Design a protein around this ligand. Structure first.
Ligand code: MTN
Ligand code: MTN
Lengths: 71, 76
């Protein structure tokens, strides 16, 4: 499924993920495509900070959702 | 040049653009200012749907023109 990650500089990155993926995995995909180290990433969805060991399904993130990335 | 983008909820947004800008760029400016994802945006001017790779000049959009923004159905 496609999701959008909006950064604070007005760049939005699109990622292809599965609900079963962990937050740690998502962060690794973002590092791979934009080079940001996972330790600098804070991911926010529906006002919750996402935790590394949970999966996207844990948070009910559905296709075409937008997560916010704060560094 | 200033252009107006009228949405279906009666909100009009003003943008500063150049005729040389592409439609893709315009959509990115709208995302930046109102948060709507480009993939949900359908831009209409003089009864044409605007295509991403063309520029505003391609369509003869002059200053103070109004484009209409229709949003693709929610989700995908
Ligand atoms: S909208 C950015 C842009 C304009 C134009 C000069 C047509 N381009 O080649 C890019 C895509 C860089
Ligand atoms: S821009 C003219 C146009 C718009 C749309 C309804 C997408 N069309 O099918 C044509 C190409 C007629």
């Amino acid at each position: 499924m496609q999701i959008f990650v909006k950064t604070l500089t007005g760049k939005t990155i699109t990622l292809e993920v599965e609900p079963s993926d962990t937050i740690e995995n998502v962060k690794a995909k973002i590092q791979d495509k934009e080079g940001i180290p996972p330790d600098q990433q804070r991911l926010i969805f529906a006002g919750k900070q996402l935790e590394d060991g949970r999966t996207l399904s844990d948070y009910n993130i559905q296709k075409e959702s937008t997560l916010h990335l704060v560094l």
